[PDB]
RNA sequence: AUUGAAAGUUUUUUUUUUUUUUUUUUUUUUUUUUUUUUUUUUUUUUUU
C-alpha cells in the first residue's frame, strides 16, 4: 500500500546531538521515526497500538536512494545512469557460474563511472537504454533559541529540513485509513509547520528468491536469528538506533550495525522468522530498475 | 507513543545636537479746472 504526505514545510531528521546543539544527518526520513509518529497517533486517537505494523521510509516524490549499478558519469557531478530493465540484464548469468568481478564491469564506455551507494537520486529522462538521473538536494535552515525564566540561561539550536511531497509503503491496515496527519521530527510538540498522511493506490509488490534492492538498512541475521543467506552483498555498512518490542520488558534502543540503504544483495533463500519489517529493516524488492516507482 | 525530552534569540539603548529664507528694491514719469454769457429792459421829481 502507497502513502503519500504533502509535507511543503521545514521539518527534523535524525539528529546528532552537538553538546547541545542538533544537527541534520539523513537527507532522507527514516522508517523508524515515521512509524514512531504514525504509532503515536494511533495512540493519541485510541491508545491500543500494534506491533505487526510495517512501513517502508519515506523519501521526496520522484526519489531513491542509489545502488552500486546507478553510478554518477562524472566524478564530482550529480547525473546518474543506468540501463533499462538492468537487474534483470543483469542477475540471470548469477545463475550461471559467471565471474562476479567480470558482472560488475562498470565500464560500459570510456572514462568509466564512480558510484555512490545510498544517495537521493530523482529520475530524469528516457535518454535511450541509459536513463538520466539527478541527485537530489533539499533546503535546510537553523533554528536556535534562547532559555529563560526576562534573562538568558542557556542556549539551544535546531536544524530543520525542507521537503516536497513524501511517499512511502507501509502494512495494509485500517490504521493509515484513521491516521490523516501526523507530528515527525525530534521535537514534535515544537517545530512542526505542517505534516499530513494521504492514502493512495494499493501497492502490490513480491518478496522471493533472486536480486533484491534493499530499500530500507537490511540485515542478514541478528542474535543468531537467520534471515536470509545472499551469494554476493554490494552496498556499504550503516549503523541502526532504533526500537522494537520483545513482549517482555525492555525492548528499545537495540543499536547493531547493518547494510546501508540502497545496498544490492543477491539472496536465494529466505527464512519463516518474526519479520524485521515492523523493525523498520528488511524492505527489500525485486525491480526492474529504478522506474519501479511507477 | 519518532533514539527523545524541554527550553521566547530574549533581554537593555529616544536618530539626537549645530542653522533667523536672509541682504539689497521710494507705485513714480508726464497733463494750467478752462471755454463761450454787457447785471440788462420798463418809470417825465413830481398837483387843489
Redesign the pocket.
Known sequence: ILIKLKVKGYITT????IR?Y?FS?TNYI?S??????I?????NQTGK?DENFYVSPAYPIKTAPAHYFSPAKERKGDEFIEVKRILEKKEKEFEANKPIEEIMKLEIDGKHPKPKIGSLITYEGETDKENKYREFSSKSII??????????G?????EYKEFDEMWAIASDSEVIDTVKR?????????GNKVVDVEKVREVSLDQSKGLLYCLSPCIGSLFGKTFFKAKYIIGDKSIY???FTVDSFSG??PVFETLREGSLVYVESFSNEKSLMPA?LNFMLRISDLSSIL
Open positions: 535524525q539528529m546528532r546531538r547541545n542538533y544527518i527514516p523508524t521515526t515515521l512509524r514512531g509518529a504509532l503515536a497517533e494511533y495512540y497500538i533554528q536556535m533559541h534562547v532559555a529563560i525564566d526576562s534573562y538568558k542557556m542556549l539551544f539550536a535546531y501526523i507530528k515527525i521530527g525530534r521535537g514534535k510538540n515544537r538506533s532504533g526500537w528499545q534502543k523498520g
